[PDB]
Amino acid sequence: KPPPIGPKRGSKVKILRRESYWFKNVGSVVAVDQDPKTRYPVVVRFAKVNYANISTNNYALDEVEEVAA
Amino acid sequence: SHSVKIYDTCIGCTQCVRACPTDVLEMIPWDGCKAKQIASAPRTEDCVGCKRCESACPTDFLSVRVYLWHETTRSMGLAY
Amino acid sequence: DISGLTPCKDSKQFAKREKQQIKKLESSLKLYAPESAPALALNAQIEKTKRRFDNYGKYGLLCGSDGLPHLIVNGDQRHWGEFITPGILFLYIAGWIGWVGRSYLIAISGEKKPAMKEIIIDVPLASRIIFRGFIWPVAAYREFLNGDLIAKDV
Amino acid sequence: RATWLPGLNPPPYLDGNLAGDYGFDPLGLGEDPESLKWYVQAELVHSRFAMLGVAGILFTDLLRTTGIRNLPVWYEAGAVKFDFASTKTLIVVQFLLMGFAETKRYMDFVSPGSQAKEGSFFFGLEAALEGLEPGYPGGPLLNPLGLAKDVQNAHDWKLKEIKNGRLAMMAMLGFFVQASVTHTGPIDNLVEHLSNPWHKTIIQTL
Amino acid sequence: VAADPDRPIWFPGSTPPEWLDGSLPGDFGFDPLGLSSDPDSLKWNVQAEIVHCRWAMLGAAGIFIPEFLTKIGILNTPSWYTAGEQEYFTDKTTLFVVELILIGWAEGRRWADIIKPGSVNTDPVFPNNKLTGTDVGYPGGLWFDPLGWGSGSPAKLKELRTKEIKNGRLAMLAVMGAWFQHIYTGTGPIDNLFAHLADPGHATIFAA
Amino acid sequence: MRDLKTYLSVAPVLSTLWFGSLAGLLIEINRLFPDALTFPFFS
Ligand code: CLA
Ligand code: CLA
Ligand SMILES: CC(/C=C/C=C(C)/C=C/[C@@]12O[C@]1(C)C[C@@H](O)CC2(C)C)=C\C=C\C=C(C)\C=C\C=C(C)\C=C\[C@@]12O[C@]1(C)C[C@@H](O)CC2(C)C
Ligand SMILES: CC1=C(/C=C/C(C)=C/C=C/C(C)=C\C=C\C=C(C)\C=C\C=C(C)\C=C\C2=C(C)CCCC2(C)C)C(C)(C)CCC1
Numbered sequence A: 001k002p003p004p005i006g007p008k009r010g011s012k013v014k015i016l017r018r019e020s021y022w023f024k025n026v027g028s029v030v031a032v033d034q035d036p037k038t039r040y041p042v043v044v045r046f047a048k049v050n051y052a053n054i055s056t057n058n059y060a061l062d063e064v065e066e067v068a069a
Numbered sequence B: 001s002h003s004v005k006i007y008d009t010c011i012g013c014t015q016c017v018r019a020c021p022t023d024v025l026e027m028i029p030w031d032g033c034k035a036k037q038i039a040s041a042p043r044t045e046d047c048v049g050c051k052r053c054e055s056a057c058p059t060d061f062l063s064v065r066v067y068l069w070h071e072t073t074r075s076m077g078l079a080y
Numbered sequence C: 001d002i003s004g005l006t007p008c009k010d011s012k013q014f015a016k017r018e019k020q021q022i023k024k025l026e027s028s029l030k031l032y033a034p035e036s037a038p039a040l041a042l043n044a045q046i047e048k049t050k051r052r053f054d055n056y057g058k059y060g061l062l063c064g065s066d067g068l069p070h071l072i073v074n075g076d077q078r079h080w081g082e083f084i085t086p087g088i089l090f091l092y093i094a095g096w097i098g099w100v101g102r103s104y105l106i107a108i109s110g111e112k113k114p115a116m117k118e119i120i121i122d123v124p125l126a127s128r129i130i131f132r133g134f135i136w137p138v139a140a141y142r143e144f145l146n147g148d149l150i151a152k153d154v
Numbered sequence D: 001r002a003t004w005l006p007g008l009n010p011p012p013y014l015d016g017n018l019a020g021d022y023g024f025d026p027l028g029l030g031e032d033p034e035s036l037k038w039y040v041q042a043e044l045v046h047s048r049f050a051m052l053g054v055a056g057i058l059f060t061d062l063l064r065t066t067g068i069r070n071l072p073v074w075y076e077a078g079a080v081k082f083d084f085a086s087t088k089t090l091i092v093v094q095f096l097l098m099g100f101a102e103t104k105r106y107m108d109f110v111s112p113g114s115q116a117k118e119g120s121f122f123f124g125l126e127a128a129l130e131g132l133e134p135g136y137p138g139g140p141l142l143n144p145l146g147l148a149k150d151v152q153n154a155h156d157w158k159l160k161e162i163k164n165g166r167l168a169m170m171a172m173l174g175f176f177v178q179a180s181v182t183h184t185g186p187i188d189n190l191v192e193h194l195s196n197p198w199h200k201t202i203i204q205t206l
Numbered sequence E: 001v002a003a004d005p006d007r008p009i010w011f012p013g014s015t016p017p018e019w020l021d022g023s024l025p026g027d028f029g030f031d032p033l034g035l036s037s038d039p040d041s042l043k044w045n046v047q048a049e050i051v052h053c054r055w056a057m058l059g060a061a062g063i064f065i066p067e068f069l070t071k072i073g074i075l076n077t078p079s080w081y082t083a084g085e086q087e088y089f090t091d092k093t094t095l096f097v098v099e100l101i102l103i104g105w106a107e108g109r110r111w112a113d114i115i116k117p118g119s120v121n122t123d124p125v126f127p128n129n130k131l132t133g134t135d136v137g138y139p140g141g142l143w144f145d146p147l148g149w150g151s152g153s154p155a156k157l158k159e160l161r162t163k164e165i166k167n168g169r170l171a172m173l174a175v176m177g178a179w180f181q182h183i184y185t186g187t188g189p190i191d192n193l194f195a196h197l198a199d200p201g202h203a204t205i206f207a208a
Numbered sequence F: 001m002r003d004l005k006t007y008l009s010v011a012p013v014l015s016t017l018w019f020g021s022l023a024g025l026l027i028e029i030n031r032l033f034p035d036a037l038t039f040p041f042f043s
């Protein structure tokens, strides 16, 4: 839909992707690609970097889950 | 020789090939990202395995990925 | 008298160790005048040795056949000064260290760039926390009961 | 208010409506609220036991030093062999009875309505254990006189209780250390201080 | 606390630092190292100077007056250096503890007064009593200021407070001078003065 | 200075300060209370 499909910009989100560095770790959604053809729109910004000194990564909608806080 | 694979978690930043010193990789158009391009690996016969491509892949773990495999004279990087 | 060990207050080889060390320090004492700094320091070390041996005697240490105090760790009430009372003395300080460090890392966790507080140690914050580990055996117990000691996965 | 040292604000997790607060929690122990409740009940019980202790020591030593009764020193008071009963029996009897007391107090603290509702038979007395409050049980068994029938609006009484009890606890620590490095009774140490105060203190022990 | 951009400074020709505006009572711009570059560091060092000054003035008095009214205005004082070896009606470690318990009270009130500017003004026993001191380090109360001289115009108050710390600074210097004298020299301070006034040349720090 | 104290609070400077103070503590304890193998108080 033209309205947002994914989490809100700023919604602290958890990663269900098993192969990511931040698995079972919280994040901070900075953007969600509203194009309904990309596979991993959810641009997250974490607090601590990965082994490649990167704090951001694209994730899917099903590979993400917002916390109750 | 080596088996280089590019997974769909790419962002099309063109650092894999611009780092690759043996012309193994090349960017192609794609529809899975905002940049509308993804890397491909046609010339894997020229792949030495130096992993400069995946030392420059800015993703969760990796999108480009080099698998060490049958080593020939050009994958072993021999001038003799 | 346990573990086949005689006490050091009634050991022969322990007194022999004493006599041998004293003769060793006296052999190095007949080379200087008895009023100069080296001889005074040697006599001070001699009294140090003698009081050391007598203190190991009077505490009820157990000296084996080799004539050296063998510490008992099993939990014998006579030998809690060997391991258990200093063990509690250790664990109290060690948990102090851990608890003030943990409460410090939790204190800086709500910072913009917390890592700079691990480099540049916020001495006011730590000093306000540095005595908060005095009560670690109760604060940690409550944080374990309340659920604040161990983190949750999410 | 006056919180235990001027120049410091009291912690925001405790203030006002509590028995003798004064805002002394520099080590962050009452930071968690349920921890503070548990510690309040702990403090009240500790202070009441300590008050009974200071009374049972000061009174016995007033009888001893002056010479009204030949009671033993507080230090060497546990090894008195009673004729009718033995200490080996008394420890077990204390365990039983004070278990029935303290576990009931506990199960009221975690569930205030307990010990009075259903199947809580104590000789048919399932009404004196209403509790009415944490740390202040009330009832005909526990306050027969009922000086403070109300307990929320009894801040003067609870404040007197907790202040006298903090002071009794400090006096009990006094009894513990003062009579482990001097090996006499408290009244002996007092009259030792009240003869030559500037020559008999803690640091006049060499 | 009015600034004086053209006040006389410790080192004329120099530019005094920015954090010494002239506001303080007796700030001649002497802070080369920058030990008061911060505002709160300056506010702390001010009270440190004040109390070091006052303790040093009491010290200089209790050294020299017992050493002046002993050598000429004949009395009997043991010394200022070896007075800690003398005996009194109390054990040496006991009255140290007593004066610690009694001085730490006042110093804790001072700590409170510095951290919180107005917190300790009410007498905790008799809250009708008060210290009418707005300025930190200068408690205008009865026990400290019964004669009413610690009030009035801020200019007169500033000149009076710089008078205070001016006396106190050379009091500090004098007390540590007596220290270094009684160490380097054997006899006492006023005896050192008389030996200097006998022969100013061959009586100084130099002996070789 | 604020930045000088920021540097004094850095991990190595504060570590050597802390361990110098600590080492002086343990040193003076092992000089005042040398040669210690057993805790004899309430032994
Ligand atoms: C007790 C020490 C002490 C302290 C804390 C202060 C503090 C202060 N002074 Mg004062 N002052 C003192 C002693 C002191 N003064 C003495 C004795 C003199 C005469 C020599 C002066 C002369 C003076 C002037 C002329 C002025 C000040 C000013 C100031 C302020 C700014 C400078 C600063 O940050 O100082 C902080 C100072 C310290 C932290 C102390 C330094 C400590 C190091 C370790 C000293 C080591 C070297 C030293 C020379 C050895 C001493 C040997 C001795 C026997 C000679 C501040 C309020 C300025 C101001 O604003 O006035 C209100 C100003 O204009 N002071
Ligand atoms: C991990 C293995 C190990 C162990 C267990 C020991 C154990 C010991 N060594 Mg060895 N040593 C080791 C490794 C080890 N060492 C190594 C690797 C070296 C080479 C660097 C040495 C070199 C060495 C030398 C050269 C000497 C020792 C000595 C000692 C003894 C120290 C006793 C002492 O002074 O403490 C006393 C306690 C302290 C210093 C700690 C004080 C802590 C403070 C006061 C806080 C506690 C109070 C606090 C407020 C809480 C109180 C309670 C209340 C307030 C709550 C002890 C038997 C000395 C000795 O006597 O040998 C027998 C000695 O001469 N060791
Ligand atoms: C000298 C002194 C301080 C000197 C400080 C100086 C020079 C500071 C210089 C600088 O910081 C500034 C200004 C600005 C910075 O940018 C630069 C530097 C250059 C770093 C303090 C003395 C301070 C001295 C004090 C506080 C003395 C107190 C004395 C007492 C209480 C004496 C008591 C007794 O004498 C009696 C009465 C009777 C006897 O029998 C017994 C006893 C006990 C001995
Ligand atoms: C008696 C004794 C003995 C034995 C003993 C034993 C056997 C024990 C065991 C024990 C055990 C079996 C234990 C376990 C544990 C577990 C766990 C699981 C824990 C946890 C904990 C925690 C988690 C904590 C934390 C902390 C603290 C508190 C401190 C600091 C900080 C921190 C945070 C780190 C002997 C004879 C030898 C000798 C003598 C003594």
Ligand code: SF4
Binding pocket: B006, B009, B010, B011, B012, B013, B014, B015, B016, B017, B037, B038, B039, B053, B056, B057, B058, B063, B064
């Ligand atoms: S896989 Fe990596 S190197 Fe290749 S295009 Fe994507 S981001 Fe660039």
Ligand code: SF4
Binding pocket: B002, B004, B019, B020, B021, B022, B023, B024, B025, B046, B047, B048, B049, B050, B051, B052, B053, B054, B066
């Ligand atoms: S391993 Fe080396 S040669 Fe092979 S694709 Fe990567 S960068 Fe190119």
